[model samples]
Target chain A: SMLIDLITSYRKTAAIYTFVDAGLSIHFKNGDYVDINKLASQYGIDYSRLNRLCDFLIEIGVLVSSDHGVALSEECSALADPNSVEFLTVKYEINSEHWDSWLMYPKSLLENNGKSAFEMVHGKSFFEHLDSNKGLKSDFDALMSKYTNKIIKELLVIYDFDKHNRILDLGGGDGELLIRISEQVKGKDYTVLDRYNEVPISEGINFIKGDFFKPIPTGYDLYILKNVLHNWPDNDAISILKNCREAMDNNATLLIITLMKKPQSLVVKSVDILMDMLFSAKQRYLSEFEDIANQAGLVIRHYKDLDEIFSLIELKVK
Target chain B: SMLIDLITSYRKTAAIYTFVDAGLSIHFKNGDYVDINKLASQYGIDYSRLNRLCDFLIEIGVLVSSDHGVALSEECSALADPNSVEFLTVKYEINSEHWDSWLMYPKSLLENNGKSAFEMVHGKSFFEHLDSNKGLKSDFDALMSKYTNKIIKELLVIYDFDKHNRILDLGGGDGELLIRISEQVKGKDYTVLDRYNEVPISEGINFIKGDFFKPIPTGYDLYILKNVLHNWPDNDAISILKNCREAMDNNATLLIITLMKKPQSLVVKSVDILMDMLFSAKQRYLSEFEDIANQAGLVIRHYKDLDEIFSLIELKVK
Candidate 1:
């Protein structure tokens, strides 16, 4: 009873991911009857593991079984709706890779060894190694890119970026945001600064090959930092912001978009803590933002709570 | 995000159990500080698992950590409460064993293989091997005794035992329930029948050291088959019931207590199905109590919901 509550808590999502990773949808679609033995043999996975997977799937409302056979449950059918693609991607795909990271996480942290989970598992930090390992990198990149569409939708409805003539994207992998902004705002020119191998060259966009730790180029009307600051400590974040401040045009605006920490809730705080451990390099907090910005000779011009877990802060040189 | 949601779903309880299992309450009773490395080295557990266990405790707010050591959180101050004791014992003890059974359930069903999960892992069925091994039998009976207290809570709330007089407890190992029932009802006598090897003789109860399938004394007014029929097929259940009928008084009530089929809610139903596959000599539903009762000339007198995962069916002569 004590552990039931605990085990059931995580079993919900872990069970769902197991179903997805095992390709149950494809397996069920191909065969009218879902047989655990057949599925295990077909997939070349352990039979016992397959059994656990199917049992949990049937436990949840995702799949059903009878003397006839197992099939996608109504809830699963509803997930295929076009509107539900966002829901599915968010529920099933996001952090699927992270599950694999957990098997090694406790060991990695205990030995006080192995790179952070990303490095230990994938052999590098997300962006750096993704370049060398294109396949897995592309999977992560596609997930990130797809999420960018959701962000762009929120930004379009929530803010007007048309006033800025030039924009710079920090850690802009593949320059999706720069390309999207250039297309959406017509006359706006965009520059992306990241590792040289991260983004391929595109029309009407300038790619600056450099690291965020080094000197940043000048003359941008707006400097955009999307999902970047969370990956560094307070001092490192201050340095990154200072670089952006030095590169900005006099009177230029700097927009910082990231997941904000809710100090009050354990969900947010524990995540803020775990993410800090996970990256071992990133600092995550909303309270620290202003202090870091101040250290970089910038003042918070405006702040808005974008959503329950998201926030944006607009800054200007004081 | 999939893993995050999965971990998030189970994180709360997982954290609580982690602390309970870590002897945190005992450790903190003496002092606020614990030596993590010393504890790990002394316990001989993997250091990393210990850290993750500690981190999980901290994450779930059950334990707090400082530069020097870890201690129990305020929420867990009542660590010696019955609920807490019950939780810790069941969570750490029973769950550890049941988890492996649950993990192996589906494979036993789908493959129709004669091999059980216990057999596959330990080269024997737990019940079969435990019967001859005193140490394992003691451990198992101790676990079951603790588990029965929790299990009986559901039965007490749902099933009426007023009409029954003397009771024949078929396969009732150690007479745990018999002792509890006798304490609840005035002027009640219970005869506990189990394998001679499995149950030890105890005071305040009559013990029949024989199998239910063999002929025995016939004066009891009620037949209480607790968690017995699930280990058998329809034919075997009928045979066991027939023996119960032959040994019972004409007015005897047949109280067949088993893990009933968890209705349309697949969460419970799959457990029934899995248990059948794993434990049944020939795959069968434990819920088919009525079928066995009817074959023994007993008509269903009452049915009651015992708990989320179990039930009771009372039968009388037609």
Candidate 2:
């Protein structure tokens, strides 16, 4: 119930940031500097209930305020710091832009009417929105870039890239992983198949623009699907796996790297649901993965849990 | 950054719960159901991307089925269970009643420009809302009753209440605390005061239909305020304290049980802010307590941290 109450409260994050950004200096009234009564009147708020707002802002590092009055501190000025711009901007954008999507979730689920959850939300899918709005696309792409970079670093430590001659990075965004792979292994060649627009031309990586559906390029030594295959349903995951198999050489290795199937923590569990709510996708766990891989003509060899946060399932193309 | 993601993602919890409540169940196609493709197509989700949604629901115990085919389970049936009417009603009411007030949180600190966060969001004062809305009032009152009972039960393990002749439950709601206190004292009289509607008249517990801002009833040997004064700014809290002081005998021993002003644990800290945002007029801190008491014509004669999570402030009516 209190959680409900907390969620119901108005978002003070943006306003507090605005206040700090505007450089509204607080004056001290007593030994405390300024009390709520004076500050609320000064700022046009109820004198009775200002401290909760101040405390939340202080907790988030946007304002330097004690329970009594806004603290005039150097650290509090960090809200307006240039280096912190990305942090605050991202926070604001995600909350504002995606809030409606969360609200539209069950409605979308009820109608079963859209190609994606996001499509049901805004009458357009995530990629469609990206297609129309260049800025949002770039922001989203940057987010994906950071995401892929983080996942790759973790997976590379656990898996060996040296033995594979040819590798497929499925739904690999902009071939960041292929570039990383090129840097990691000298002789290995990496093929990245993703939305054409998602791949930026770069040295050492072959970018193939095609849907994972129709048919993929054949004869690769390894196939790596990172954070991509999970967005689709089991059939789609199977179809993508089949495509990977048809494109692979006889001894090809398929590396399925994605979010862990079952998350132990509430954070992981919630994000798993959020991905579905916003994007109309689901991350897969281990058991479903083995069945999907096997049905698609890939033999499950051995899968290793990477970090506690994620895992890697390796299958050989049959 | 990850923590922020976790916190922000909390918004989706309500959405997922709502989805399960809608009865648009996800069942995998083949008896071998973990098939994301079959369910996605059946549900009009992008086949390749529906797995993440399933995984999340599965993790939360709201949905079940394997990665191959995930479906809404009986556990989640409560979500949409029309038969479980009370649970759904309560859940919906809790969300609706509190969501708006929470939205005005940012304005809570701005003195004159906005109402109290509660008023800013709800268009009425907190007490006023409780007074007028029967359903919300009952839930809020019941929560306090259940909470106070827990505290009294816990207190009984360590403290002896049998010695006190007269005990005052300052700002006690519905007299549950007084009921417990009266039981402990055998024949002692317990006085309970709060919003006129909340104070319950009982055999051994006297209910006063008056506001705490007015003079408290006189001649009590002991006074107790549970989870009060924290909602007001220092001046108002001081005024209320003064009123309580005026009503108390000079020899009165005040047992003020409250959430620790400076809670060290994460759970306590989170609840403290939440309580402020949800119910209080202003958030209180450890620093403000002594000062408010001092101005109220009450002297803090003794203080102890009951546990790291709770505090007891002993005061004397001067």
Candidate 3:
């Protein structure tokens, strides 16, 4: 049973999402229990069908049922929020598009199709399909925002934000990271560059909608590529880095803020595989990052873990 | 986060299965390192795609790579055999049909379509579809036989087979259980009844093509319902048990061999969920079993676990 042990995990995640999606988990979000059958109508799922998932949840300590019905267990109360960062991350991970893309991974490998596994399922590359599907894009943006917020605290601790007065966040989806950074470090000019135009939700930050493959606006004291290059293959990542490098003067500093994949960590490996399946890209190791940075005519000035989960690399023009 | 921890388990299992499928794991089965790229062509998967799976495996201690290639880690050598009961069970678990059915479970719950999740994916009830698909049937039988063989030693320890002079196994597809039992317990009459005809693979066993819902052959000292009743809904299971009860004499003993759900174990709960998705059936607790047995005019004489995993319930006429 390593298989059983592992398979049960997917069962847990899928069941939790099912509970959340069917409006079952929300009832138990507070300590109060509610009868699954009584609440089934609100979610439109059948009473018996919804019960099947609750039954499993009850079996594991994630839930406990009494005469009133089921409620989240004390240990699992952290799962009370459906829109929490970790909760939405799991939700996005098990989404129909995401799960099916994984299911078709074997086909993508065997067929040797130029299309990624996600592309095979959606009939367009991950970004292309995201543009066409507003719902997916919306959910994706939410996940990214929540995720950045969760990791932002850790990311800020490892880098000196005050040293760079002029900062540009490349592919900064909603400029949330810049906004978060600005909250901590005052008197800093901020700009966010993305391929798509996203109006800055807050005042003070500059928002520019432009492609990174072409020329990026110059003169920023510091450039930020948080979770950006990892969204692309090596060539594109290097090309984007090249553009940033070309736009920078020798005095400019570039921060490559992303996950530095640990070869030994299953979470890291899973993310790497997921990147490939979804975008035909991968989270790279320090060596791989250095290779790409050097290929783009940049040298790594320093690198350090923001925490066990994320890393910050300082790059200078070679 | 709980989600990340839980999600990593699935990543381990899927990556391990992919490694096994791509012929990557077998090279390292003996703990001898072999390069993943070197073996990719033999398996007809592209080197890069195969490497994606290997990289994950290597990240985990399940595999270690050398200059020559990858090899199974010492602790994970147990996974060397693709034909292993556990390996095959995991394979069947992640099968195209099974996984897709799981993905469709939410829809089945929401739609209130009489179709089980499995039915929604395949457009046929599980058993009806099984007959039409030879490949699935073959894999299923192998899993069953391997599973039965694995459980037989513990089962025989719990039940006294020598007390029954004549035994009949309803829905015994291949009589492998009888064959294994006969090897240890001498010269007792044995017969297997099923709707479809399968020859008795070993001597001293009779094969009858019959349905359990109809009147079965009478006058057997012991009747075995090994892993049978759990496959159907309560109504069907009750009716079949009723037929068996009517065919039996007052002296006859009926043994129902199936899992007794603990409501605490994830494995048992998962099996219960899977049974519902595939057969619209749920594994029963002792009380539930009692309810069905009472409906069928049978009284529980004794109940005991063959092990922590399986249970044997002995019943007699009410």
Candidate 4:
């Protein structure tokens, strides 16, 4: 029964994904009904092919076509506007597009050799591919910004940040994490470091144009590497950790906050596979982190389960 | 909620599929549990990769690993027997392997270039792949027997086979349909035609070694073409129909029993996409069949949906 449930679901996602990918969903936003012929010609997709896809979508309850025109189904309206940031479309679209990457995984077992399953399909690393694809990158950026707010509120409430007078967020996109940090605390120097000029927020929140793979600026009391190491394989992860390790003094502390995999947790485990397929990375347990930390000449001072999924690992130079 | 429902569902199916494809689910068949180390060596998958997958499956409740060993979760035991034709494994395994083929639909829309989405991925037609892959074909054959039984009983009861003396089961697999038909009535002539020597069943069931793409024997009172036309696109479908048309006398009838697409039907619609993806074919509505029937110099004398899914079309030479 569960297998059948999953079978029905696979088709549903595939149908909805193809509809969105074909740019049909956006036309529904201006009005409930859309002239499919006009839209098909506008998008340059074959009319018969569009009907082939749309007919399936209609049966799957993602769309409804009447004598007038085609419209998004009531249940599927949450994703009708592809530009909706708060709705499911943000990450849903992102996940849908790359859902096939996970399929290349079995092939990746042998054919991947060292590259990710994603790399085999897309011909480049995930981030590099994203850099080249502007449309996908923008949605990714939007989702990242939303996820930053989603992660920071509870993290600040539980952990005290005042212990650090100087804070640097390495590879922090848009400085949303440090931006929220500024709202809660004052009279501290906050720095966000990244290769891009993605500067935002104000007042004491300094932006550093830099790459984390290279040398990190020293003398900060704390370095926050949130969700960074999970994006890199072991060699690359350790290299990033070592950069922070080399830049840190004896008293400086580094906080690596990431969704740690727990045996009882399914989402983290799902994320683990996502990391594997997309980035050639895996989210490590504390025991696994020990070897990585040791290689970087750092020791885990303390480990705190920020929530069910995230763990804040406090590291100091050995 | 539905969007998230689909998202989670996609992940569950993917995880279960990877486990099955790796040949891990079968180990649970002998006993309730099996050792991971032993199975890892047997499958030639890296222990780390094995753990990466099983860890997720456990999180999803499809598996439960203890100090003793790993076993299929009680909920997932239905599919423990990969050989179980009645269970989900038959279509489920077949579907899992080709799940990536559906992924190529978006690409197929633009670059299909008159090829199927499946052909683009597998580098051959669906039937060609089946013929080459002994493992998949056996499962397919098993499932066909089961499906033939499921379909033949109702069709025999609802429709009269006594209208004709000569009964030819065209492109029939294993003669299960005719074998079942023999159980209902004392047939005058029961011939099963196919390219391979796939003959089975007893009593008045004659096996003819031939291809349907070539000439079919003339003078069959009732030519039983059950679920055959859906495997070919309209052009090929018309050719098959015309062959029946050319060989038929005025009194002879062609019983085309297949799943007919209903506007309110999802499964038929799903099959339509599946046909598009796998076979470059479609399950058409009766109105759509009108053109093909007209082109083949045959007329649809009667159309009856035996069940909600399957349609029985009776045709005679124009």
Candidate 5:
């Protein structure tokens, strides 16, 4: 019965995509129930056809319907606001164009060619594909920025950045986290090291175009590796960590921020599976992190559960 | 948060697909734990890669893992059995190849092209594509037969086949339902009407090759329309009902077997959405069924919810 539920849940997912992509969410963004016929006619869609889709949406709790018509549910109202990350994520990252690639996952496993499911479907690695496609790059950047902004706010509350004089955000993609940190902790030096040609320009922030696996810039008191290590296999992850370890002073701390595998949550586990499929990388448990830190000549000095899914592992050179 | 959950849940779905398609379910069908490395090597899959996937599977409750290795959970053992409907549905109908088309659902809604998402993706109607592909057709037939067999058993319990002297199953693909019904209740005339060149030959049964929309076989005491109406638009559905009404005598009963839409269940609602996407048809609420039946000069005489999803609506000519 749960297996059947999984198949049906996919349709709910599809309906959500349709609701967002067809701009129906935007039409009902004001939270006012509108006549289904009028809305359909205005959108140049068949009234009956749109009504059927809306009916399913209502069933899924994304929308509410009555004799009056239909309106976006309170939980789904964010989907209508274009500025909301929820809206942007649905429009660009979660829509058909992005998700269709995942459907080839089974074939990728069966073929066992060592290429990612993403690579198999797209005929190129994810980063290569993103680099070549300007639109996708922007979309991906926007998504990452949204996530980084949220994570930075949470990190600021939990971690004390005022004590660190020099901080480097390794593999920081657009410098969002670094800029946020710089703004919050005045007079502290902030640097973003990434391969991207440009970082989001901000006052008093240094942008270094470099690779994390290669020699990292030396003498940083704190290195923030947010969501970076989980993108590579264990060997490459260890190599990256070793580079940071070599660059760090004996007292320097490395904060590795990523989702930790928890037994009961589907969210972190699903991410673990996705990372494996996309990059052959696996999300680590605390034990696994301890092993990796040990391999890189580092010890876990502190560990903090940042949120339900994300965690921070603070390591120091052994 | 739910939006992110939806996005990540796709990965969970993908992991399930990978597990089934990798034949790991079968490898551990007997519920005995096998060493991860040994199993991976036997399957020619990367040990680490398979291990990560299996780890997530354990998190999702599809498998149990320990220091010894991995084994299918009791709930998922059915997935390894070829004879299980759960196995067939995942392997054939709910697999990536079939579901990839739904990713185009947004496009189908936006274009208002009045073509199914299936046709938009596959460049042919679902049945046409099935008829052309031998493998898909067989898979589809197997899935339908499984459902038919289950429904037949339920109908035998809830419905009295002893009351009706003769029964005709309209659009019965392989006469499995009628054959099962015949087996349960002795000394009843059973006929299967379908357009196929040959029906699965069964003893004590009659097969008539014909189009249901044109003229159904006449004078049967009961007409069984199992899972046929939801495959067409309202007009076509009504037309098919009208044909059955025309063929029926005044005392004849029409048993319409299909899934009924529940208030908040994604199961029925998703099936409804899929029908709309694939055939421009909508599953009916009781009221909608009333309207359709009234249009066809038939009155709903009896309504029985066979299971949570399926229902048997007995209609009679007005």
Candidate 6:
């Protein structure tokens, strides 16, 4: 019975994505109650097909049907907002990009060859594909930006940013973190380093176009590697951490904010597998992090729990 | 928050399939508790990788971990049984075969053409692919046989077969339905009509190898079409129905068992989309069924609700 329940839940998930892609959410956003025939006619879609989809949506509580017509349910209001992070994430990441690749897990595991499913499916590394596809890269940036905003808010609240005069965010896409920090903490020198052709042009923030695996700019008081190390294997992660170690003075603190491998939250667990599937990387345990940090001539000075989804490991030159 | 929850659930689904493929369920089935390191070493899997997967499984209640190592949770016991229908269905259908094609919903919807997503992905029709691949076809037969077994039990209880002396099951793969009915109801002639090279041979059951779209054999008191029409488009469905109608006498009853479109159960809704992606067919509503049946000179004489996931419609020649 539990297995049947799991199967049904999976079906409901597929239905939700289908409804979103069919422009049902957008149509609901435009009007409160949509007439089945009129809406199908307006969209040039088959009335019967749209009607059946609406039936499933209503059964799933994403829509409600009555004598008045079909409308978005109370809990699904956020789905109608295209600009909402929930809608954008589901559209860009779950439904569109990652869904197929995730299904290749069985094959990937069977091969056990360490090749990521994303690379296997696309015939290129995830980052290489992103670099070539500008539109996809932008969607990825937007998806990350949603998480960046939440992490920045939590980072400012729990961590003391006022202690450091100069800070650099490694692999900061779109400079969202630098911009947020610049806005929150005044009189602090902020820099964002990325390998992209162009970083976001934010006033009062220095943007450096460079790779984290190579030499990073030297002499920052605090180096922030938020959600970066998890995107790399241990050797590559150590290479980046060693570069950060070289860039930092003995007193300079390195804040390695990432999803740690304990307490096993669902989001972190999923992201862990996703990282493995996409990049051949992984979320690490504290002991595993210690081993890699030690290899890079850095040690964990203090461990701070940022939130349920993220943990901050402060590292310093050994 | 709901969107993130949905994303995590999707990831868990992937993880479950991954675990099944990795033989974790099989290993645990042999013993009550498994040592994390010992099991991985025995299986030649990366110990750390397997451990992390176990951690996530424990978090999701699919597995329980302790000093003893990993073991199946209460509800997940069925996963350990490789022969279990739920396990087989999830493995072959959800994870391996149809999962990737279902992700192309946007493209299929945009094309608005009759071509299925499976055809687009594999460069062949779903049935054609099944015909060519022996292993996949075997798995599909196993998957369908599970459903056939359930439907047969329900059919025997809900409907009386004693009224008819002769019966034919059209498009019955493996003759599960025919064999079950023959075993239960004695002294009735049973025949299975399929296009396949082989049908499940049973005592006193006749096997006819032929296409349903062409002429069907005449002189059957009752003709049964179970879980067959949903795999075909309306025109094809009508064509097959016409042949059945032509083969039957005026008093002959046609039993059509399928998942109808209404009440919107998850399994039915999922199968609807799967049919669309794989065959460009659809689960029809009662009205739609009426229209199609009328085209084939058949009418619904009596409708029997078998269960939430299945329905049986008795038809007669008009």
In terms of lDDT, model 5 sits at: 0.78
Q: Looking at model 4, give its docking quality level.
A: acceptable
Task: Go through the candidates in order and give each one's C-alpha lDDT.
Answer: 0.61, 0.61, 0.77, 0.75, 0.78, 0.79
Which has the greatest DockQ?
A: 6
Best-to-worst DockQ order: 6, 5, 3, 4, 2, 1
**Per-model TM-score on C-alpha atoms:** 0.57, 0.55, 0.86, 0.78, 0.85, 0.92
Fnat for each predicted structure, in order: 0.14, 0.20, 0.45, 0.43, 0.45, 0.34
Interface RMSD of 4: 4.8
| Model 4 clashing residue pairs (backbone) | none
Candidate 6 similarity to native, TM-score: 0.92
Question: Over the full model, what C-alpha lDDT does candidate 1 score relative to the true structure?
Answer: 0.61
Give per-residue CA lDDT, model 2, range B212-297, as digits (tens).
78777787888888878666656677888888788887777877777764523433444555555555543355567777887777
- For model 1, the stretches where C-alpha displacement exceeds 4 angstroms are A1-7, A18-78, A81-139, A153-166, A194-210, A246-252, A263-277, A280-286, B1-145, B152-257, B264-267, B270-308, B312-318
Mind giving the per-residue lDDT tens digits that candidate 4 earns over A18-41?
Answer: 666555666776448887777768
What tens-digit string does per-residue lDDT give for candidate 2 at A117-197?
Answer: 466656765665666676666555566665556666767778888877888777776777788768767776777777765
Better of 1 and 4 by DockQ: 4
Highest TM-score: which candidate? 6
Query: Per-residue alpha-carbon lDDT of model 1 for A62-87, expressed as tens digits?
Result: 67787876776654553333233433
Report the Cα lDDT for residue B39, model 4. 71
Candidate numbers sorted by lDDT from highest down? 6, 5, 3, 4, 1, 2
Candidate 1 colliding pairs: A9-B9, A9-B10, A10-B10, A94-B1, A95-B1, A231-A282, A232-A282, A232-A283
lDDT at A169 for candidate 6?
A: 90
What TM value does model 4 have? 0.78
Alpha-carbon RMSD of each model: 9.2, 10.5, 3.7, 5.2, 3.8, 2.7
Interface RMSD values for all candidates = 7.8, 6.7, 3.0, 4.8, 2.5, 2.7
Q: Considering summed lDDT, which 10 consecutive residues are worst modelled in model 1 chain B? A: B90-99
Model 3, range A124-183, lDDT digits (tens) per residue? 777776666666676677888886877777777777788887999888878888888889
